[PDB]
Amino acid sequence: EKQIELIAFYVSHLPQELAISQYAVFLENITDPDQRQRCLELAKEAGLDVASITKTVVENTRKKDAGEFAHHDFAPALDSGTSEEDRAKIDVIDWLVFDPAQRAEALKQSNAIMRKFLASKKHEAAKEVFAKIPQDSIAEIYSQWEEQAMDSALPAEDDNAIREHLCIRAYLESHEAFNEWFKHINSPPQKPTLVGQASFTEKVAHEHKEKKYEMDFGIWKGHLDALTS
Amino acid sequence: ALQYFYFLRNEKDNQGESMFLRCVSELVIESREFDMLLGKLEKDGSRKPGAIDKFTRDTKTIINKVASVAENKGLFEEAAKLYDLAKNPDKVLELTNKLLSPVVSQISAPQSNRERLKNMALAIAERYKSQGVSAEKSINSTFYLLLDLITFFDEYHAGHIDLSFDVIERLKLVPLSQDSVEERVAAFRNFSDEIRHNLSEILLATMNILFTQYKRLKGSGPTTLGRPQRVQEDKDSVLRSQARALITFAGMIPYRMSGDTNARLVQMEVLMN
Amino acid sequence: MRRSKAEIQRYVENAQNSASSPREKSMKGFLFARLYYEAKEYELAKRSVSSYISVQERDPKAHRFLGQLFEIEGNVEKAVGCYKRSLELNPTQKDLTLRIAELICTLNIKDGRAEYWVERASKLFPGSPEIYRLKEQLLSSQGEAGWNQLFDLIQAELFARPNDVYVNLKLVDLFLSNQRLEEAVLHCLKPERRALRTDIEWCSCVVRVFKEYLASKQGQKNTNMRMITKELLLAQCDVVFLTLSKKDVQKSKEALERFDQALLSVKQSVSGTDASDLSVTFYEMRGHYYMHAGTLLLKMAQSCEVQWKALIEPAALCYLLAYQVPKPKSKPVKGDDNGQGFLEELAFDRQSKSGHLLLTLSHGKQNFISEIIETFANQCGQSILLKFLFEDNLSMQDSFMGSDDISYVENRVPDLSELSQHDNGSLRIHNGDLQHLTWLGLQWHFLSTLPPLRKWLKQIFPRVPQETSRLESNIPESICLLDLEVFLLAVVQTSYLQLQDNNTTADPNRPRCLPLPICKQLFTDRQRSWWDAVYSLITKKALPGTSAKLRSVIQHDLTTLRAQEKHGLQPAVLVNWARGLHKTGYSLNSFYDQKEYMGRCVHYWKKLLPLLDLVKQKKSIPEPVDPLFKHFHNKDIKVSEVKDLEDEACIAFATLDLVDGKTEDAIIAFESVKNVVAYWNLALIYQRKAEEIENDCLPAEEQEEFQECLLKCKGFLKMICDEYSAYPSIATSLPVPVETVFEMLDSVKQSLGEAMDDHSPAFMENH
Amino acid sequence: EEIENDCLPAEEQEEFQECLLKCKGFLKMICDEYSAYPSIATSLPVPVETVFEMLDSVKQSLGEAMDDHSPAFMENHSVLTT
Incomplete structure (x- = not known):
């Protein structure tokens, strides 16, 4: 019968396990930002943990996908495109980032899908996701951790996420430097290449090109x- | 159906197209049948005076619009058959290339039905081109290019390396030497969007074949296990030439792709260097 | 911190819990330092955070907290070191490197690490004011060798982004430090600073720089000095306007003192203030001061104070004197055009505003001259005239510069053509300002005159949008002037209704329409955004990447406005559309324009009729989900003008039928309905047909048809006069006055040859 | 405390010190009223131990040897932190 304003007020009567397991499938098919925020407000008013519901949704999707070549560089067989699960993996991030509260788990899942993309060869999508997400993720993570006033039960997930983000940033910077260097090699190497000089305007254009090449090389x-x- | 169309055609245009045209398009895309209503086909014949054709004219344009609507919706084989009935080699080759372009990126081994569909479509297109006037010059050039490319693709997927090497050498279109890079770049300016897009997969298959050949050459002994040192040196020199030509092409073409493809290109360049 | 019973209980409980091992306290040192910093205790907080760092060096939060504590205390070097350690640990903030560079430049460091961090910040974040500031502070610590690099850097920054107030201020400061007063004056007089010469702080800085330059180089008479004096006077007038736009006697006195100081500084360098262009500049200053004094008087009279009925005469005399004195329209020596353009624009704007306000206060024509003459006569009248010319200056009156000099007020009235020219000139720099167009439409509706919407739109869009009546194939590029005119008329009518509903406690002696600086945006920002998007798509001032979606949105909005495929407007706004279309159509004598107007009318009515069918049963008003206007006055539920709306819909239907070739059904519907608009359109059509017939031959059948048409037109004018004399609602629902109708009826009767009083008399309309 | 929770420059630090001085003056007036007659602990619902702990917390939050505003009272029945 649809009507999203009537599902949250009746799901709470179910046992927590089954209620969460069914709200997972209920929220798996949710679009439109207005309807998303309406369902968020309804869940917050009814008292349902929509954050953990979305986390369990992502966990179930990852378990159904069974990963992508684990966390090791495995080259595909013959010629093939991207995986069929990468679309769902990149589309599930919308509802995950729509709720900025669980930044730690968000960055953990981001590092997980980044390792999956690196294993299944998806550096372009990895770069797009890295450009979409901010760089102070671990900063906000430890800020929330120190603001929540709970340093007694401090695990190692924060340091693991810090190391993962640092290594990912280093690898992406190395790749961008490599491709920029190759594009500069393909372009003229900023050297005075003789292309035919026999006039005043020709020598003026050559001097201007040499100056621009020197500046670009610097x-x-x-x-x-x-x-x- | 025709009795109702006789009344539906009396209405003029209303906010683009016509209600009669929309109704007949919906009916034909829901029925998917035209061997007696629009015209029978032996294998690539012309059109026949069908039931609607014996009462209304503009049948060629009607069939063309119906096939265009079907292609925009998501129909391939029926749209190809309709265009073959309406006799339109340009549109036939266009839809053939448009349907074979996305499948080139994925595998081409006999694993489903898409490969059989593309094979029968290519056969129908080639027999239509043989029996009658084909398409334009650039369209026929692109068709032959795609035929050779899918041939090399299936030859590489079947597990053979020497066959792929000799067909890619007889194609006479890859960068051979430095004096050939110039004409290769000159001909690249007269290509198309698909011819520029499939270059990624073409270079990937080429580098895979070259790496397999280099690994086999390294596994084979220089003085023992066959392959004399002179043959090894000749193969190394021809690999040097091919790599130099390919890297000059990729460096002086006005087109860049991605960092991974560029890195693999330079990797094969220095492997053969 | 907080120490109470349960507070100290929990404190000692946590202390006993963490007393099992020193590692517990070593790891809780974070919360320990947090509670410390809450209770000050900087030394204890630093000790706890140092213990936490020694425990887990891989925790940037502790280093950031220690750096913040050091910055709060005063150890800037220690804070910089802690921030550098945090940055080396991980880039926790993009602005962290900028802050480190700025702090190290304030501490004056230039050996290795400082330059390295400055280069890192410049490579990470692009050109920014903070980056430029830290680079300048780094280069200024090296001396002349660093001063040359700073000059090269600021020159490169000015070549890159010339429109930057901070960059201009820093360049002026560098010029003042290097004692390059001429260079600073040239940089301030650069033509690229005319668009930035608007902020109060920047204008005051320019005024101070000009005054210092004049005090330093007093005793020279040159064209450059005259131009500097003129620009300083312009900036002084601008800051006086900005300070007197409010109601602050202290700000008024400060502006007066600043103007006096500027005049004293000018009299020390330039010999007087009257010359070739100096006289015109002084006349323009006096006119602007008079106009602003009149505007302030009108504002203080409208704001409901202690004097609002007798202050309309001094303001009128001040406006008359400001109109009599010359205005900057054509300078004799064309050299300072960069400022002359803005001066002429501001003069046109203030002239149009003052004229509209005076005409709205006088209601039609300036009838205050009769009262002025009746009041001014004997010695008391002369004294009152002198006091009105000198204005009022007591304890709360702000009119220090409003004192008129030696002159006399001449009786004059503004011109409608001059007002239209001023509006067209203002729209060029307004770029289609919706608020300005709304204020102009409100003033024109208060004056009861047809606003030049065609000229307004032609001046707004240089592409000159043609008039079309499209019904199929929606094209966003093929914009029509009819839709723009309809939207403008709707906005004007809604703003007029809002003003009439809000002026419940207002006095008739006060200006009905609010001035421009205080009447801004009387609706919803959605309309302004749509108008801006339309103007950008027309003038090609958008982005080629989003041009597709912009054109799609514009086409969807145009379709929704035309109401031919998608509907969702309001009955009130549709009635406003119909009324504006009728007022713009029946006021002129055209052919194809009237046909397009009637086509738009019937296209609106064909969808307004289903909406009007719901407001007759006293149900819910069909309001859309997006608020387009203020939902507090557009409530259609009163059954009052529904008969007139149905009559107008029938008129549109009959006109569409007559256009499509159905004259019989058209005349049948016209004779069935009873509306003055129907008979007016019938008379216009009959006159046009009679003219087109007389342009050719006149056979017997054509002569009989012409006589029948003239008789029908006479009867239509007679019943129009009868309906007008019936109920006063015709005077409101008729876009054409009854005087023109009676004149046309008399002309038709004279052309026919009748003169009796049995049908349409001579010196009266009815019987 | 809510103000001190954030970064405070010179003016904010001086206003925090002024608020602390006002609270200390209020607590000193309360302590003087309690010492003038032993009935405040019986009148107020909280004993004098709560007021003593509040005064101790205020003296601890005032600082130790870095306060920008010198106090003008004497610690009665309490310890001296600043």
Whole structure:
């Protein structure tokens, strides 16, 4: 019968296990930001843990997908495109990021799907997701951890996420430096290449090109030396 | 159906197209039958005066619009048969290329029915081109290119390496040497979107074949286990030439793709270097 | 912290729980330092955070807290070190490197680490005011060798982004430090600063720089000095306007003192303030001061104070003197055009505003001259005239600069053509300001005059949108002037209704329409956003990437406005559309324009009729989900003008039928209905047909048809006069006054040849 | 405490010190009223131990040797932290 304003007020009467297991499938098919925020407000008013519901949704989707080549670089057989589960993995992030409260688990799942993409060869999607997500993720994580006033039960998940994010950022910076260097090699190497000089305007254009090449070479060497250091 | 269409056609246009056209399009896409209503087909014949054709004209344009609507919706074999009945080699080859382009990216081994569908579509297109006037010059060039590419793809997927190597050498379209990079770049400017997009998979298959050949050459002994040192040196020199031509092409073409593809390109370049 | 019974109980409980091992306290040192910092205790907080760092060096939160504590205390070097340690641990903040660079530059460091962090910040974050500030503070610590690099950097930054108030201020400061007053003056007089010369702080800084330059180089008479003086006077007038727009006697006195100081500084350098262009500049300053004094008087009279009925005469005399004195329209020496353009724009704006306000206060024509003459006569009249010319200056009156000089007030009235030209000139720099168009429409409706919407739209969009009546194939690029005119008329009518509903406690002696600076956005921002998007898509001032979605949204909005495929408006706004279309159509004498207007009318009515069928049973008003206007006055539930609405719908139907070739059904519906608009349109059509027939030959059948049409037109005018004399609702629902109708009836009777009083008399309308 | 929870420059630190001085003056007035006649502990629902703990917390939050505002009272029946 649909009507999302009547499901949360009746799910709470069910046992917690079955209620969560069914709210998972209920929220798996939810679109539109207005309807999403309406369901969020309804769940918050009824007293349902929609955050853990979405976390269990993501966990069930990952368990059904059974990962992608585990966490090891496994090259596909012959010629093939992307995996069929990558679309769902990249689409489930919308409802996960729609609730900014569980930043720790959000970054944990982001690192998990990043390892899955690195194993299944998806550096482009990895770069797009990294550009979409901010860089102060671990910063906000430890800020929330120190603001929640609960340092007695401090595990190692924060440090693991810090190390994972640092390694991912380093690998992405290395890859971007490599492709920028290759594109600069494909382009003229900022050297005075003889292309035919026999007039005043020709020599003026050649001098201007040499000056621009020197400036571009200086900027390239500077930023590449910084990144490589 | 025709009795109702005779009354539906009396209404003029209303907010784009016509209600009669929309109704007949919905009916034909829900029925999927035209061997007696629009025209029978032996294998690639023309159109026949069907029931609706014996009362209304503009049948060619009607069939073309119906096939275009079916292609925009998501129909392939029936739209191809309809265009073959309406006699339109340009549109036939266009839809053939549009349906074979996304399958080139994935595998081509006999595992489902898409490969059989593309094979029968290619056979129908080639027999239509043989019996009658084909498409334009660029369209026929792209058709031959895609035929050779899928041939090399299936030859590589079947497990053979020497066959793929000799067909890719006889194609006479990959960068051979430095003096050939110029004409390769000159011909690249007259390609198409699909011809520029499938280059990724083409280079991937080429680098896979080249790496397999290099691994076999390294496993084979220089002085023992066959393959004399002179043959090894000749193979190394031809690999040097092929890599230099390919890297010059990829460096002086006005088109860039992705970091992974670029890294693999340079990897094969230095492997053969 | 907080120490109470249960508080100290929980404290000692936690202390006993963490006393099992020193590692428990070592790991709870974070909360320990938190409670410390809550209860000050900087030394204890630092000790606890140092213990926490020694326990888990891989925790950037402790390092950040220690850096914050050091910055709060005063150890800037220790805070910089802690922030650098946190950054080396992990990039916890993008602005962290910028803050580190700024702090190290304040501490004056330039050996290795400082330059490295500055370069890292410049490579990470792009060109920004903070980046430029830290780079300048780093380069200023090296001396002249660093000063040259700072000059090169600021030159590159100015070449990159020339429109930057902070960059301009820093360049002015650098010029003042290097004692380059001429360079600072040139940078301030650059033509790229005319668009930025608007903020109060920037204008005051420019005024101070000009005053310092004049005090330093007093004793020279040059064209550059004259231009500097003119620009300083313009900036002084601008800051005086900005300070007197409010109601602050202290700000008024401060502005007066600033103007006096500027005049004293000018008299020390430039010999007087009257020359080739100096006289025109002084006249413009006096006119602007008079206009602003009149505007302030009107505002203080509208704001319901202690004097609002007798202050309308001094303001009128001040406006008359401001109109009599010359205004900046054509400078004799064309050289300072960069500021002359903005000066002419502001002069046109203030002239249009003052004219509209005076005409709205006088209700039609300036009838205050009769009362002025009747009041001014003997010695008491002369004294009152002098006091009105000198305005009022007591304890709360703000009119220090409003004192008129030696002159006399001449009787004059503004011109409608001049007002239209001023509005067209203002729209060019407004770029289609919806608030300005709304204020102009409100003033025109208060003055009871047809607003030049065609000229307004032609001046707003340089592409000149043509007039079309499309019904199929919605195209966003093929914009029609009819939809824009309909939207403008609807907005104007809604704002007029809102003003009439809000002016319940207002006096008739006060200005009905609010001035421009206080009447901004009388509706919903959605309409302004839609108008801005339309203007951008027309003038190609959007983005080619989002041009597709912009065109799609514009086409959807145009379809929703035309109401031919998607509907969801309001009956009130549809009635406003119909009324505006009728007022814009029946006021002129055209052919195809009237046909397109009637087509738009019937296209609106064909969807308004189902909406009107719901408001007759006293049900719910069909309001959309998106509030387009203020939902407090557009409630259609009263059965009052529903008969007139049905009559107008029948008129539109009959006109569409006559256009489609159904004259019999059209005349049948016209004779069945009883509305003055029907007979007016019939008379217009009959006159057009008679003219088109007389343009050719006149056979017997054509002459008989012309006589029958003239008789029908005479009868239609007679019944129009009867309906007008019946109930006063015709005077409101008729876009054409009865005087023109009676004149046309008399002309038709004279052309026919009749003169008796049995049907349409001579010196009266009815019988 | 809510103000001190955030970063405080010179003006905010001086206003925090002024608020602490006002609270200390209120507590000193309460202590003087309690010492003038031994009936505050019986009148108020909380004993004098709560007031003593409040005064101790205020003296601890005032600081130790870095307060920008010098006190103008004497610690009665309590310890001296600042």
